[PDB]
Amino acid sequence: WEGLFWEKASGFEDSMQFKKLTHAQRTGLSQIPNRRFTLWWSPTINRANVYVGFLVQLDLTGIFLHGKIPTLKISLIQIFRAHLWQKIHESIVFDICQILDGELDVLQIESVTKETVHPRK
RNA sequence: AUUUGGUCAAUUUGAAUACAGAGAUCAGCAGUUCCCCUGCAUAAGGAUGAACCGUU
Numbered sequence: 001w002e003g004l005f006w007e008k009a010s011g012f013e014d015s016m017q018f019k020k021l022t023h024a025q026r027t028g029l030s031q032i033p034n035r036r037f038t039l040w041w042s043p044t045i046n047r048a049n050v051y052v053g054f055l056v057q058l059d060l061t062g063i064f065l066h067g068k069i070p071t072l073k074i075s076l077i078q079i080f081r082a083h084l085w086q087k088i089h090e091s092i093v094f095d096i097c098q099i100l101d102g103e104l105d106v107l108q109i110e111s112v113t114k115e116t117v118h119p120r121k
Numbered sequence: 122a123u124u125u126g127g128u129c130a131a132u133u134u135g136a137a138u139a140c141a142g143a144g145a146u147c148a149g150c151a152g153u154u155c156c157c158c159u160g161c162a163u164a165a166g167g168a169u170g171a172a173c174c175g176u177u
Contacts, residue, residue: 053127054127056127059129059140059141060140065127067127068127068128069127070127073127073129074141077129077140077141078141080140081140081141081142082140083140
């Protein structure tokens with residue numbers, strides 16, 4: 001974490017408060033700094049010890065919520081847009097396959113078959 | 122001591138597909154108004170110059 005920096009929330013708010021904006025837009029902007037915060041602390045806001053109840057699965061992902069932490073949910077959705085989770089998984093699988101191919105004769109491997117799976121796997 | 126504040130929308134329906142939802146960023150130039158300078162025009166208004174005599 002030596003080189004890193006935040007763009008601050010206040011700064012962000014300021015930047016987009018130089019525009020022809022209806023009050024709703026402004027309100028949304030104001031909200032956005034919380035969203036980021038929520039996302040940051042997501043892995044210790046969204047857990048069984050913190051909240052309890054309908055442990056729902058966010059769509060297309062293994063990201064279980066622990067209550068509609070709505071901002072958090074939104075952030076998660078944004079992150080994992082375009083079937084991202086699936087892509088990640090498949091990518092990893094592909095990588096593994098490649099690795100296997102690279103080291104066949106050393107480990108005594110005949111053939112390496114990527115099993116065709118249900119899209120939701 | 123329990124619980125509500127937790128419903129994706131959209132499309133195809135008579136649950137399936139969707140899976141968060143669909144120009145950005147950098148840069149010119151002109152115009153708008155006011156000001157200043159400059160050249161020209163238009164009016165007006167000066168100031169001044171230029172030999173030497175004139176017209177029935």
